[PDB]
Design an enzyme around this catalytic site. Sequence first.
Site, PDB file in Angstrom:
ATOM      1  N   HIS A  41       0.799  -1.227   0.000  1.00 18.94           N
ATOM      2  CA  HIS A  41       0.000   0.000   0.000  1.00 18.94           C
ATOM      3  C   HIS A  41       0.839   1.288   0.000  1.00 18.94           C
ATOM      4  O   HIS A  41       0.256   2.367   0.097  1.00 18.94           O
ATOM      5  CB  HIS A  41      -1.080   0.043   1.097  1.00 18.94           C
ATOM      6  CG  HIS A  41      -0.559   0.215   2.497  1.00 18.94           C
ATOM      7  ND1 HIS A  41      -0.219   1.463   3.001  1.00 18.94           N
ATOM      8  CD2 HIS A  41      -0.360  -0.711   3.460  1.00 18.94           C
ATOM      9  CE1 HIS A  41       0.182   1.252   4.243  1.00 18.94           C
ATOM     10  NE2 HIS A  41       0.118  -0.041   4.566  1.00 18.94           N
ATOM     11  N   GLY A 143       2.781   6.293   9.961  1.00 19.40           N
ATOM     12  CA  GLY A 143       4.154   6.149   9.509  1.00 19.40           C
ATOM     13  C   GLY A 143       4.858   4.912  10.033  1.00 19.40           C
ATOM     14  O   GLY A 143       5.989   4.624   9.636  1.00 19.40           O
ATOM     15  N   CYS A 145       4.033   1.928   9.333  1.00 14.96           N
ATOM     16  CA  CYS A 145       3.833   0.881   8.346  1.00 14.96           C
ATOM     17  C   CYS A 145       5.159   0.375   7.855  1.00 14.96           C
ATOM     18  O   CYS A 145       6.055   1.166   7.592  1.00 14.96           O
ATOM     19  CB  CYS A 145       2.957   1.390   7.211  1.00 14.96           C
ATOM     20  SG  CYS A 145       1.240   1.706   7.691  1.00 14.96           S
TER      21      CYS A 145
HETATM   22  O1  QVU Z   1      -3.502   2.290   9.287  1.00  7.32           O
HETATM   23  C1  QVU Z   1      -2.639   2.984   8.750  1.00  7.32           C
HETATM   24  N1  QVU Z   1      -1.577   3.504   9.416  1.00  7.32           N
HETATM   25  C2  QVU Z   1      -1.287   3.394  10.787  1.00  7.32           C
HETATM   26  C3  QVU Z   1      -0.608   2.308  11.334  1.00  7.32           C
HETATM   27  N2  QVU Z   1      -0.604   1.981  12.632  1.00  7.32           N
HETATM   28  C4  QVU Z   1      -1.262   2.770  13.464  1.00  7.32           C
HETATM   29  C5  QVU Z   1      -1.932   3.953  13.078  1.00  7.32           C
HETATM   30  C6  QVU Z   1      -2.549   4.869  13.968  1.00  7.32           C
HETATM   31  N3  QVU Z   1      -3.101   6.018  13.585  1.00  7.32           N
HETATM   32  C7  QVU Z   1      -3.072   6.318  12.277  1.00  7.32           C
HETATM   33  C8  QVU Z   1      -2.527   5.514  11.317  1.00  7.32           C
HETATM   34  C9  QVU Z   1      -1.932   4.287  11.697  1.00  7.32           C
HETATM   35  C10 QVU Z   1      -2.696   3.354   7.266  1.00  7.32           C
HETATM   36  C11 QVU Z   1      -3.155   4.813   7.089  1.00  7.32           C
HETATM   37  C12 QVU Z   1      -4.575   4.973   7.602  1.00  7.32           C
HETATM   38  N4  QVU Z   1      -5.472   4.005   6.967  1.00  7.32           N
HETATM   39  C13 QVU Z   1      -5.022   2.819   6.423  1.00  7.32           C
HETATM   40  C14 QVU Z   1      -5.911   2.018   5.713  1.00  7.32           C
HETATM   41  C15 QVU Z   1      -5.465   0.861   5.106  1.00  7.32           C
HETATM   42 CL1  QVU Z   1      -6.582  -0.058   4.151  1.00  7.32          CL
HETATM   43  C16 QVU Z   1      -4.136   0.473   5.230  1.00  7.32           C
HETATM   44 CL2  QVU Z   1      -3.576  -1.025   4.556  1.00  7.32          CL
HETATM   45  C17 QVU Z   1      -3.250   1.259   5.943  1.00  7.32           C
HETATM   46  C18 QVU Z   1      -3.673   2.442   6.546  1.00  7.32           C
END
Ligand code: QVU
Lengths: 302, 296
Positions: A41, A143, A145
């Site tokens: 992603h 961030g 990820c």
């Molecule tokens: O989750 C995500 N990031 C984060 C990781 N870890 C913790 C968080 C905490 N608060 C914000 C963001 C965080 C990302 C961006 C936001 N949405 C999203 C959606 C999908 Cl489908 C996928 Cl695969 C990745 C994300």
Amino acid sequence: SGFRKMAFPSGKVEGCMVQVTCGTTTLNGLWLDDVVYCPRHVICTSEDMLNPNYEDLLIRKSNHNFLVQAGNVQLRVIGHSMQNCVLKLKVDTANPKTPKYKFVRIQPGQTFSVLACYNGSPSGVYQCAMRPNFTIKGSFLNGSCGSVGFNIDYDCVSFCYMHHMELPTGVHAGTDLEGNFYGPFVDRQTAQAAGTDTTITVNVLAWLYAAVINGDRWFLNRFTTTLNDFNLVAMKYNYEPLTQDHVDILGPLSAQTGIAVLDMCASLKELLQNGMNGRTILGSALLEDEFTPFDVVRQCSG
Amino acid sequence: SGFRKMAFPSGKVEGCMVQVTCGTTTLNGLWLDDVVYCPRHVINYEDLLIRKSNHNFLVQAGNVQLRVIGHSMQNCVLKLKVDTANPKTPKYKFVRIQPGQTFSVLACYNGSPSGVYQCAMRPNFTIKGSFLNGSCGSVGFNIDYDCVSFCYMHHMELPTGVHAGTDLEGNFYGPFVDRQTAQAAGTDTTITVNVLAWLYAAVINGDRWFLNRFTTTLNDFNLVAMKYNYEPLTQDHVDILGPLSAQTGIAVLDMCASLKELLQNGMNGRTILGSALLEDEFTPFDVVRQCSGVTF
Ligand SMILES: O=C(Nc1cncc2cnccc12)[C@@H]1CCNc2cc(Cl)c(Cl)cc21
Ligand SMILES: [Cl-]
């Protein structure tokens, strides 16, 4: 003596953390030899998130679209492929800090260390377990990820997790290092909810054995139980069924302490019924489930 | 989201762990530049050290054997001068921490790092660590930007399972001595500022059940805190909690009144950050660094 939630030394994994940028998105990558692994992603945009065709999005990318950064040095991407939900960025430099490693897929209940990263820069390390619902109760911000989960057994680093996303309940979903997601999760913004969580029974029993090794016997009792009577009681407290496999795994600890697995089960049954009553087991007022039988033996013996 | 007991990345410290052997004793040493630091109990320490020669100490860095060229003692720490300067030496400082301050511990056995954990210097000057025989010399540290601040070296375990050690200058934390005699850890107290910091991190993560409309005076809070074996909350602590008070919108003496009720009444089957007890091993800075994503 002493019992702590301990993580593996993060040194071998720190040497592998790189920053991966594509367009506006910036996340972390795992640089091992001449390949940088990161969540697929990273190629995603604002509108290509609810229903992304990653095969179509990656075909529109060239190697120079990905800016890989290892410390101050910029790595040059020479190839790119996608394996399930991870992007494999081939680079022109092999990581000299590459350790001996393996990609392992763990099962629920297994514990591992997490090296939390922001912009390819390690900020902290913590120990956590793969929950029975396939989520991890991590500590992640935007961030994070591409942060990885690992076990450094002997001298080899076993990579078992790459963080991909946070679910609406604050829990996290991610993949093994082959891009296969843990649980029924997908890398789409769609409505996804973590399944009902359960307590890892085998890990709670291992932790009771570590308490016995440290001289905490207050919770022990004169009773034993059948495996089926224990599971009928455990299911009512939202505990994972204890299989015969779990009983066998607890064998060494049962021998070391001199308390049969089914006897320790009856201790747990009484703890579930009564609670702690102002007491603690290993400085904790709750029944801890993020120490496997293997972790207990490691930290209590060697 | 999420709150975990997090330790600093141990990488910079791993490069400094060596195995120090003298006679039957085998423990760990901290190799920084051309000096290896280790507990002096490896060897009347002045009389025992005068009978030693450089080749008595077998220093081992991985598979490579380091050759000792000099030896001196600074308080309870032995400084073994070696022929080779550690190429993996990071930017570092030797700092003495105060009770309540937290630090990471890189537990080692035979100069080999096995685990890393986060823990706090208890108000009684002991650390509730996780140590076995052979971990004497395992170090405590904090990362400040890119600089490793060494604050602890493990020397022993007290009869209660708690640990006693020194700063990297060999000065013990607490009233402990490195000798075979009756030594008991003092009555422990809870680190009030750290509990308040942890309540702020719970508020940041959406746990607000413990909050109330009430506030308290610092004098009335400290009266209650003293009764529950809690460390006195100074005006300094109130100021340190300032940023968290602003970020959440709950005054420090407002959060104190929540702690006041949590102490007299308890949690009542509820948890705060997955815990049924009031956690005191996260400083106000740890809460900020974790809930803001500071990197090293
Ligand atoms: O989750 C995500 N990031 C984060 C990781 N870890 C913790 C968080 C905490 N608060 C914000 C963001 C965080 C990302 C961006 C936001 N949405 C999203 C959606 C999908 Cl489908 C996928 Cl695969 C990745 C994300
Ligand atoms: Cl597994």
